[PDB]
Enzyme design. Structure first.
Site, PDB file in Angstrom:
ATOM      1  N   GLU A   1      -9.989  13.301   6.782  1.00 21.18           N
ATOM      2  CA  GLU A   1      -9.134  12.846   5.692  1.00 21.18           C
ATOM      3  C   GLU A   1     -10.102  12.823   4.510  1.00 21.18           C
ATOM      4  O   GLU A   1     -11.186  12.253   4.621  1.00 21.18           O
ATOM      5  CB  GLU A   1      -8.624  11.437   5.976  1.00 21.18           C
ATOM      6  CG  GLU A   1      -7.782  10.860   4.864  1.00 21.18           C
ATOM      7  CD  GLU A   1      -7.366   9.442   5.142  1.00 21.18           C
ATOM      8  OE1 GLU A   1      -8.129   8.706   5.794  1.00 21.18           O
ATOM      9  OE2 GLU A   1      -6.272   9.056   4.710  1.00 21.18           O
TER      10      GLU A   1
ATOM     11  N   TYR B   1      -6.284  14.577  -2.713  1.00 20.21           N
ATOM     12  CA  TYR B   1      -6.255  14.030  -1.363  1.00 20.21           C
ATOM     13  C   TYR B   1      -5.686  15.001  -0.326  1.00 20.21           C
ATOM     14  O   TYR B   1      -4.704  15.695  -0.578  1.00 20.21           O
ATOM     15  CB  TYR B   1      -5.430  12.739  -1.421  1.00 20.21           C
ATOM     16  CG  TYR B   1      -5.081  12.120  -0.098  1.00 20.21           C
ATOM     17  CD1 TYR B   1      -6.050  11.483   0.675  1.00 20.21           C
ATOM     18  CD2 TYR B   1      -3.775  12.150   0.372  1.00 20.21           C
ATOM     19  CE1 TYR B   1      -5.722  10.895   1.878  1.00 20.21           C
ATOM     20  CE2 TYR B   1      -3.435  11.563   1.572  1.00 20.21           C
ATOM     21  CZ  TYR B   1      -4.414  10.937   2.322  1.00 20.21           C
ATOM     22  OH  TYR B   1      -4.070  10.356   3.515  1.00 20.21           O
TER      23      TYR B   1
ATOM     24  N   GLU C   1      -2.617   6.436  -5.383  1.00 19.26           N
ATOM     25  CA  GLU C   1      -2.542   5.464  -4.318  1.00 19.26           C
ATOM     26  C   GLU C   1      -2.637   4.082  -4.939  1.00 19.26           C
ATOM     27  O   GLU C   1      -3.384   3.876  -5.892  1.00 19.26           O
ATOM     28  CB  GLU C   1      -3.676   5.680  -3.321  1.00 19.26           C
ATOM     29  CG  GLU C   1      -3.625   4.734  -2.127  1.00 19.26           C
ATOM     30  CD  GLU C   1      -4.657   5.065  -1.061  1.00 19.26           C
ATOM     31  OE1 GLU C   1      -5.014   6.258  -0.905  1.00 19.26           O
ATOM     32  OE2 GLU C   1      -5.111   4.124  -0.373  1.00 19.26           O
TER      33      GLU C   1
ATOM     34  N   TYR D   1     -10.970  12.640   0.013  1.00 19.78           N
ATOM     35  CA  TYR D   1     -10.613  12.214  -1.338  1.00 19.78           C
ATOM     36  C   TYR D   1     -11.632  12.699  -2.362  1.00 19.78           C
ATOM     37  O   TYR D   1     -12.842  12.609  -2.148  1.00 19.78           O
ATOM     38  CB  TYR D   1     -10.620  10.687  -1.459  1.00 19.78           C
ATOM     39  CG  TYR D   1      -9.615   9.911  -0.642  1.00 19.78           C
ATOM     40  CD1 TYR D   1      -9.793   9.713   0.729  1.00 19.78           C
ATOM     41  CD2 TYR D   1      -8.533   9.292  -1.259  1.00 19.78           C
ATOM     42  CE1 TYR D   1      -8.914   8.913   1.460  1.00 19.78           C
ATOM     43  CE2 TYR D   1      -7.655   8.491  -0.540  1.00 19.78           C
ATOM     44  CZ  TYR D   1      -7.851   8.305   0.816  1.00 19.78           C
ATOM     45  OH  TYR D   1      -6.987   7.490   1.510  1.00 19.78           O
TER      46      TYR D   1
ATOM     47  N   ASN E   1       0.862  -1.175   0.000  1.00 17.28           N
ATOM     48  CA  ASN E   1       0.000   0.000   0.000  1.00 17.28           C
ATOM     49  C   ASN E   1       0.909   1.238   0.000  1.00 17.28           C
ATOM     50  O   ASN E   1       1.896   1.283   0.732  1.00 17.28           O
ATOM     51  CB  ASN E   1      -0.887  -0.021   1.252  1.00 17.28           C
ATOM     52  CG  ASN E   1      -1.762   1.216   1.383  1.00 17.28           C
ATOM     53  OD1 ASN E   1      -1.998   1.696   2.493  1.00 17.28           O
ATOM     54  ND2 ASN E   1      -2.260   1.729   0.259  1.00 17.28           N
TER      55      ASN E   1
END
Length: 190
Positions: A86, A77, A177, A88, A44
């Site tokens: 957070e 982001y 990502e 997106y 990741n």
């Protein structure tokens, strides 16, 4: 240049690159607002360029090539403090829709496409302030693209109508990502 995980400013733009230490990822800072990511059977990771701090009315332009081979996302982001959020604004993704399992709050039209809005809570997860509990806001574009302009105000306004109240804006980047997949991307931010 190709670097290990870290943050800083490069050619006028803030950058942030992080990975879980799995391997198979190569992040490179390029000229101006450009960055390239090449990965193969990675873990990741998240890498991109933008601003620190970002704003609530910034219009972000991006262009380049995005060729995911599996699970990956291309999006605006960032983070907010007080409240800790957070977020997106997903422009494109590979084999997996990131909003899978999230709660749809509504829809918003912005920059040539309708976006579906979602929210999820991360309990005792790592964040810009350490282990904390916060919400995760999502805007997922229906018509995928690897080049265009994002008017962040349209999303922040939409989210605000659904109960979000962004406080102090921390970093804001256009990030790629990846999640245990492969691919390549070369994106330029401005």
């Amino acid at each position: 240049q190709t670097i290990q995980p870290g943050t800083g400013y490069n050619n006028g733009y803030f950058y942030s690159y992080w990975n879980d230490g799995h391997g198979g990822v190569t992040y490179t800072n390029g000229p101006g607002g450009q960055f390239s990511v090449n990965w193969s059977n990675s873990g990741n990771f998240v890498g991109g360029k933008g601003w620190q701090p970002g704003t609530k009315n910034k219009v972000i332009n991006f262009s380049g090539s995005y060729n995911p081979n599996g699970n990956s996302y291309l999006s605006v982001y960032g983070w907010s403090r007080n409240p800790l959020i957070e977020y997106y604004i997903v422009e494109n993704f590979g084999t997996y829709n990131p909003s899978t399992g999230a709660t749809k709050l509504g829809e918003v039209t912005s920059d040539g496409s309708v976006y579906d809005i979602y929210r999820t809570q991360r309990v005792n997860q790592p964040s810009i302030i350490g282990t904390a509990t916060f919400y995760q806001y999502w805007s997922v574009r229906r018509n995928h693209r690897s080049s265009g302009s994002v008017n962040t105000a349209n999303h922040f306004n939409a989210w605000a109508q659904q109960g979000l109240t962004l406080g102090t804006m921390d970093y804001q980047i256009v990030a790629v990502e990846g999640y245990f997949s492969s691919g390549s991307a070369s994106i330029t931010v401005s």
